[PDB]
Design an enzyme around this catalytic site. Structure first.
Site, PDB file in Angstrom:
ATOM      1  N   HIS A  40       4.030  -7.286 -26.078  1.00 11.33           N
ATOM      2  CA  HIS A  40       4.134  -7.437 -24.626  1.00 11.33           C
ATOM      3  C   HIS A  40       3.247  -8.552 -24.066  1.00 11.33           C
ATOM      4  CE1 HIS A  40       0.675  -4.497 -24.012  1.00 11.33           C
ATOM      5  NE2 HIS A  40       0.459  -5.298 -22.985  1.00 11.33           N
ATOM      6  N   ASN A  54     -18.735 -15.272 -23.163  1.00 12.48           N
ATOM      7  CA  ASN A  54     -18.468 -15.478 -21.740  1.00 12.48           C
ATOM      8  C   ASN A  54     -17.219 -16.367 -21.696  1.00 12.48           C
ATOM      9  OD1 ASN A  54     -18.277 -16.656 -19.129  1.00 12.48           O
ATOM     10  ND2 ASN A  54     -20.449 -16.255 -18.762  1.00 12.48           N
ATOM     11  N   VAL A  57     -17.604 -19.872 -19.405  1.00  8.70           N
ATOM     12  CA  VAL A  57     -18.575 -20.933 -19.715  1.00  8.70           C
ATOM     13  C   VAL A  57     -18.487 -21.365 -21.185  1.00  8.70           C
ATOM     14  CG1 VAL A  57     -21.059 -21.402 -20.008  1.00  8.70           C
ATOM     15  CG2 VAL A  57     -20.245 -20.129 -17.986  1.00  8.70           C
ATOM     16  N   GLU A  62     -17.321 -21.634 -29.754  1.00  3.30           N
ATOM     17  CA  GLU A  62     -15.905 -21.485 -29.430  1.00  3.30           C
ATOM     18  C   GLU A  62     -15.042 -22.407 -30.270  1.00  3.30           C
ATOM     19  OE1 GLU A  62     -18.116 -22.339 -26.960  1.00  3.30           O
ATOM     20  OE2 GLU A  62     -17.935 -20.968 -25.290  1.00  3.30           O
ATOM     21  N   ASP A  84       5.243  -2.381 -30.512  1.00  7.00           N
ATOM     22  CA  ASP A  84       4.533  -3.350 -29.690  1.00  7.00           C
ATOM     23  C   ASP A  84       3.515  -4.102 -30.558  1.00  7.00           C
ATOM     24  OD1 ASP A  84       3.621  -4.783 -27.505  1.00  7.00           O
ATOM     25  OD2 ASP A  84       2.529  -3.122 -26.620  1.00  7.00           O
ATOM     26  N   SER A 172      -9.443   1.793 -22.299  1.00  8.64           N
ATOM     27  CA  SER A 172      -9.132   0.366 -22.283  1.00  8.64           C
ATOM     28  C   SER A 172      -8.289   0.220 -21.007  1.00  8.64           C
ATOM     29  CB  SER A 172      -8.359  -0.077 -23.539  1.00  8.64           C
ATOM     30  OG  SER A 172      -7.223   0.730 -23.790  1.00  8.64           O
ATOM     31  N   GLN A 174      -5.755  -2.861 -18.339  1.00  9.49           N
ATOM     32  CA  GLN A 174      -5.000  -4.111 -18.274  1.00  9.49           C
ATOM     33  C   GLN A 174      -5.944  -5.270 -18.601  1.00  9.49           C
ATOM     34  OE1 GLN A 174      -3.316  -2.906 -14.037  1.00  9.49           O
ATOM     35  NE2 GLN A 174      -1.904  -4.356 -15.006  1.00  9.49           N
ATOM     36  N   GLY A 175      -5.458  -6.223 -19.387  1.00  9.48           N
ATOM     37  CA  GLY A 175      -6.284  -7.354 -19.770  1.00  9.48           C
ATOM     38  C   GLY A 175      -6.841  -7.160 -21.169  1.00  9.48           C
ATOM     39  N   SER A 177      -5.035  -5.521 -23.345  1.00 11.17           N
ATOM     40  CA  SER A 177      -3.782  -5.547 -24.108  1.00 11.17           C
ATOM     41  C   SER A 177      -3.799  -6.503 -25.297  1.00 11.17           C
ATOM     42  CB  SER A 177      -2.622  -5.949 -23.188  1.00 11.17           C
ATOM     43  OG  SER A 177      -2.346  -4.955 -22.223  1.00 11.17           O
ATOM     44  N   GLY A 178      -3.306  -6.033 -26.440  1.00 10.50           N
ATOM     45  CA  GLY A 178      -3.263  -6.860 -27.632  1.00 10.50           C
ATOM     46  C   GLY A 178      -4.545  -6.846 -28.437  1.00 10.50           C
TER      47      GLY A 178
END
Ligand SMILES: CC(=N)N1CCC(Oc2ccc([C@@H](Cc3ccc4ccc(C(=N)N)cc4c3)C(=O)O)cc2)CC1
Ligand SMILES: [Ca+2]
Length: 223
Positions: A40, A54, A57, A62, A84, A172, A174-175, A177-178
């Site tokens: 989804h 974060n 920033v 990263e 899913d 958990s 929304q956001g 997800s996955g």
């Protein structure tokens, strides 16, 4: 994550953030070039962001890599959320180190009561919206199938399991997800759905990863 705690920079090295100009879903790094997420969360123009804490920033560590292809499970049903699960292949292999590492797939399914770590940059509020800058963590146990099916009559398939707290307050959202549900060093679940967030008697529902190990391996091998 509602009712969780700040994980601490890079303490969940396999956590990934899916970005399309903003964070929209989480994911798990399973090898240097593949990420597992929720079907989804599928969208075109996905940039996979590894080694993040974060999300607003640039702090160092990263790695931004474009998705070369997203493979949504062929039998995914958008109404029931059965199957899913989605695999994302990175355009280039990630540089694995202390802060960016892969998580292992399970060899067996986890049992009720097993404590797991769930993480993400999703909504931190039950009533309202508040998105965090840094990664949030939550320790939650896998619930029995009986309690799961009692909470969501006729909506739980064999490819789903419930995890969380029936008293509400920790879940958990929304956001998230996955994102990953890791138990004993193995990825057992993927944040899928639920009724609201951290509501009494409405635990989170997760994709049962142990049912897809063969599919994941066969698909990765042919791509
Ligand atoms: C008909 C059926 N079989 N169902 C009911 C719908 C269900 O799927 C969904 C799909 C989306 C939604 C939400 C949005 C949402 C999205 C991600 C979420 C992730 C985690 C949680 C959680 N409380 N753990 C809740 C979420 C709620 C929304 O209110 O839009 C809720 C249920 C699949 C199962
Ligand atoms: Ca950032």
């Amino acid at each position: 994550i509602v009712g969780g705690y700040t994980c601490g920079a890079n303490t969940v090295p396999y956590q990934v953030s899916l970005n399309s100009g903003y964070h929209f879903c989480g994911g798990s790094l399973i090898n240097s070039q593949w990420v597992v997420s929720a079907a989804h969360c599928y969208k075109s123009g996905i940039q996979v962001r590894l080694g993040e804490d974060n999300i607003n920033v640039v702090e160092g560590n990263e790695q931004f890599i474009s998705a070369s292809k997203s493979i949504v499970h062929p039998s995914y049903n958008s109404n029931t959320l059965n199957n899913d699960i989605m695999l994302i292949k990175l355009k280039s292999a990630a540089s694995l180190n202390s802060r960016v590492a892969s998580i292992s797939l399970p060899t067996s399914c986890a049992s009720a009561g097993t404590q797991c770590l769930i993480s993400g940059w999703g909504n931190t509020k039950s009533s309202g919206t508040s998105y965090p800058d840094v990664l949030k963590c939550l320790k939650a146990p896998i619930l029995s199938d009986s309690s799961c099916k009692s909470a969501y009559p006729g909506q739980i398939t064999s490819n789903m399991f419930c995890a969380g707290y029936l008293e509400g307050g920790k879940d958990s959202c929304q956001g998230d997800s996955g994102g990953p549900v890791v138990c004993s060093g193995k990825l057992q679940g993927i944040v899928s759905w639920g009724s609201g967030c951290a509501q009494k008697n409405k635990p989170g529902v997760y994709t049962k990863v142990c049912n897809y190990v063969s599919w994941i391996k066969q698909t990765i091998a042919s791509n």
